[PDB]
Amino acid sequence: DTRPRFLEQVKHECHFFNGTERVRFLDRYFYHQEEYVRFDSDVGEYRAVTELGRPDAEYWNSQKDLLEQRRAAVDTYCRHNYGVVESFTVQRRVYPEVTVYPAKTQPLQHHNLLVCSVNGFYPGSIEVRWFRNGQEEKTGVVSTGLIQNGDWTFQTLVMLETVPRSGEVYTCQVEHPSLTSPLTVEWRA
Amino acid sequence: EHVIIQAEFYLNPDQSGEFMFDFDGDEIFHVDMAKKETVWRLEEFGRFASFEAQGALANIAVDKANLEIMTKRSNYTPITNVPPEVTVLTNSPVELREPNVLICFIDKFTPPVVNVTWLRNGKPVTTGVSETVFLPREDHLFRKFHYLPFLPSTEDVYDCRVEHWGLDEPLLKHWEFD
Amino acid sequence: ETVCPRTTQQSPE
Numbered sequence A: 001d002t003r004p005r006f007l008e009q010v011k012h013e014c015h016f017f018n019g020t021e022r023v024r025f026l027d028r029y030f031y032h033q034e035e036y037v038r039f040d041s042d043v044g045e046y047r048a049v050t051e052l053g054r055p056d057a058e059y060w061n062s063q064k065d066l067l068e069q070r071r072a073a074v075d076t077y078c079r080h081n082y083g084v085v086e087s088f089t090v091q092r093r094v095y096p097e098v099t100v101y102p103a104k105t106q107p108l109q110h111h112n113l114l115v116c117s118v119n120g121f122y123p124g125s126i127e128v129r130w131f132r133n134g135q136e137e138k139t140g141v142v143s144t145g146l147i148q149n150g151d152w153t154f155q156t157l158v159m160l161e162t163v164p165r166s167g168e169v170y171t172c173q174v175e176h177p178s179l180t181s182p183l184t185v186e187w188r189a
Numbered sequence B: 001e002h003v004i005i006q007a008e009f010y011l012n013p014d015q016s017g018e019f020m021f022d023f024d025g026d027e028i029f030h031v032d033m034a035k036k037e038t039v040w041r042l043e044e045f046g047r048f049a050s051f052e053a054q055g056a057l058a059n060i061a062v063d064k065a066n067l068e069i070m071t072k073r074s075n076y077t078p079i080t081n082v083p084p085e086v087t088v089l090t091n092s093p094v095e096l097r098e099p100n101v102l103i104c105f106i107d108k109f110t111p112p113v114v115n116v117t118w119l120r121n122g123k124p125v126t127t128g129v130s131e132t133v134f135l136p137r138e139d140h141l142f143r144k145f146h147y148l149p150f151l152p153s154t155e156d157v158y159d160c161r162v163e164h165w166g167l168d169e170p171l172l173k174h175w176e177f178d
Numbered sequence C: 001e002t003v004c005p006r007t008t009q010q011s012p013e
């Protein structure tokens, strides 16, 4: 099937700063990926983003009742829906499971990679650090970065490249808003 | 600090529509257009809130009308296919005989039409699979998740097979134990 | 308790 496709998108966005103290509403219309017209609550009228959207801005801006609907959106739409969903979105906290296992940069060489697998947490902001015998190791650290699982949980792997010596204790330390104290997991050579 | 987006689309000639709410990149719910039901991404969401699915149907009807208008205005300029990036990963560190989930992440593509197949040892599997709807990105492409619960063994290999009009051949992304 | 939709409006023809 090589028939041409045509896509229309609309995104009505509510941006919240300090709870619902500062709220910005954006009404955005797109043809394929091209935003052609938008309403920005900072402005209070539709403005064409590209030439394609000039007719829509002029026509919609002539509808005072429509504009007054959009000017009230920060209250009647954004703040309202925030109050509806806040208890299970804004306030969602799911602490991570932390697992440490060894691996190899080269399948034939010996174990020279410590993986700190941090799984199932929400929200996304997290800090993961490596320690060798109580001292933070910042060199040789590589990560997948933040991974969305698509089910309101995140994961991340933080890997430390190192040659373990007998005696050493490695610590992976996780901080996250769901925790009141750092979560640490040790690994011994 | 937080962003809630009500994202809609309508696609011709497929006559596909979609209506969803996003919170900080996660789906709160979408509306099943054929059943006219609100589908909460986590079931527990539905006990703390509701949504009248009819409102989505009304918006999608306007989006359809606007697509026809904008198609004309553009002189029937079609969308350019953007093929996806595909990643396969597991929900949690893998241990033999301990239940887990394979995640197939399909990212950065348009249009929102895709064929996805899970393969176990080269054979299609459908038992217990699930998927998300098309999820919006900030660059206005799409992403999507497909899920396969599985029991890790050393005998089974897996692939996520993704077809998309922007790809010349199907994209296969492999997973196996280790 | 009810999430409220923002309506979309029709472009000029």
Ligand SMILES: *[C@@H]1O[C@H](CO)[C@@H](O)[C@H](O)[C@H]1NC(C)=O
Pocket (backbone or CB within 6 Å): B073, B074, B075
């Ligand atoms: C469509 O073609 C008309 C007539 O040449 C032109 O005025 C208009 O700018 C075009 N619109 C596009 C290419 O978006």
Ligand SMILES: *[C@@H]1O[C@H](CO)[C@@H](O)[C@H](O)[C@H]1NC(C)=O
Pocket (backbone or CB within 6 Å): A001, B113, B114, B115, B163, B164, B165
């Ligand atoms: C999916 O497969 C069907 C046939 O089952 C085909 O008609 C359609 O073009 C395919 N879609 C994509 C995006 O490859």
